[PDB]
Design a protein around this ligand. Sequence first.
Ligand SMILES: [Fe+2]
Ligand SMILES: [Fe+2]
Lengths: 333, 333
Amino acid sequence: WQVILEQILFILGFASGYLFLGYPADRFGRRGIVLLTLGLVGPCGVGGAAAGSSTGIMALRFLLGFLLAGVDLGVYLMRLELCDPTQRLRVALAGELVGVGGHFLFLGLALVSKDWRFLQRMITAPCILFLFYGWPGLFLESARWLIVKRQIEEAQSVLRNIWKNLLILGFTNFIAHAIRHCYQPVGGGGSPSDFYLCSLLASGTAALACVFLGVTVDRFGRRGILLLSMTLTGIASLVLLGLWDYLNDAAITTFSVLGLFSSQASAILSTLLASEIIPTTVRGRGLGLIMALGALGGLSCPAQRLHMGHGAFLQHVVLAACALLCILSIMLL
Amino acid sequence: WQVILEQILFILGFASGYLFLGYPADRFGRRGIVLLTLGLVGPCGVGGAAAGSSTGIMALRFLLGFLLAGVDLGVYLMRLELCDPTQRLRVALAGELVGVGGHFLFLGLALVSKDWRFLQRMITAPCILFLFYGWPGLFLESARWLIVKRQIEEAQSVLRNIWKNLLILGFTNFIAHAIRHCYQPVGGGGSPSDFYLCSLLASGTAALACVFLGVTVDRFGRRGILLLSMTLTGIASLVLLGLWDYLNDAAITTFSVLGLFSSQASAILSTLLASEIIPTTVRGRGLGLIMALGALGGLSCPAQRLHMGHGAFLQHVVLAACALLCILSIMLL
Ligand SMILES: [Fe+2]
Ligand SMILES: [Fe+2]
């Protein structure tokens, strides 16, 4: 499918950006890279939406994904640096649903506009990745951090071991991404007709996935919830597959929507935990790599869940059994 | 003030672009101008947020307003051409949610992130202009039309008197813009602590302002409601000024929130009405002009409303009395 090829190229662009723009991030700086990546995302995204040739379309889509990866990593670094450690957690949580907000707003626009005309060409349902349609302005709306840095610099001028936690968090971040798309018993999107019902659900499920992850991790600790946010999907994925002995089609939805809680809470939280282990220096080398594994792990739905479709439980059990490995290694932190 | 000088420049950037970028929209086509303007919005908006020197801060804010002028006007021409005329009313209405979506999300992330720090070093409060912070999203999110145009154009390859209504609508669009900001007993919210309560109100009031303008103007006609959406602000602005004999501070809010209905429904509906009068040719010179006066009419908040504030009833009554000229000229259509 053309859309799935776009999504796979976009995920590969995210992987390449997250894996190759860390060294510039910690060498050149954490501010200039954001400006360069955003000022290239703009024209690159416009051209990708403009120049339609089916051969350069994927090239500019990959380039846009690479630049979006760079700007996302830079924005993450600036958020974790400028903000005070007392409330940095809330900023990071709000900085992880920014793409969720962009995608939900795009879908709401399409609904109120009633213009479902970019659909009806897609043979299969599109991948739900947020940043595919949550890039347009969500990151340029997150340019508020550039303003904050500008005012901080102006005020300043006026006044004038590690690898062990990287692999455990890398696998946890990778699994928490590649298992989110597996919580979809209705095909791999249930045709584009049901795409909005799943985009609203996934975005809406991410909203509550930041509530019990937003108000409890401070009291319970980031490691304690990460174990719970990885064992909740360790029960939400067996009864979904193994013990689904007449789940009456209603316990199939209370568990999948519960799976998207833990899967999207063990991916948001795992990104935060990588910051503490890595020092201020070379922070982007490893912290970007953790989501680089995660961004590369967004290949569940596009690469295999939609392409094969039939017998997709074999991927679900492999990833669900891999969650046991992540659970047994989370306590090792 | 430092912030309000951007708003005057942005509006003058919006007014200059709306008036000047009408010749290209009818000579160079309605699609290329969108790609050129939106392509340049990215780098321009980032550069304005990057190079902070108080002289380029407004220099690339004027240019950003000029570029966003073509984007809003260029999308509008494609909105009413690509979409079917049967449901063009909903698309154009939902297309006017460009300001609300981008602005509301900007103060959506800030509420969750609790990062109200860019408003600390700022005196009084910024003007409530949605596209000031709603520019990032809802325009590159409104690239769906470029996607839609690509599919339609690709499908084709597969198969291979007037001035009287301009002044009445121009004045109506201008008045309906410059009177909305006058529905504020506190100037711009006064202290910045009330800015979100006014941004949520104005955006929320614009939400219902598209409901009774969305479900009734089809049955009642665009001209009939425009008279009612201009005679409603002829009472919400008259009893707020003339008969405010102990409105007990609660009937004041039931009228301001009712004034923001009519003033933001006689500004959205007026833009739609001018589309039909002007033919398909020279549909950018005049249709842009109606909101070129309207965008130039967005100076009311940067005007006496916020600059001096004291005795600003004189500016409100002048516009309210001018609204009498607006309603009396509506039947002349
Ligand atoms: Fe991300
Ligand atoms: Fe506009």
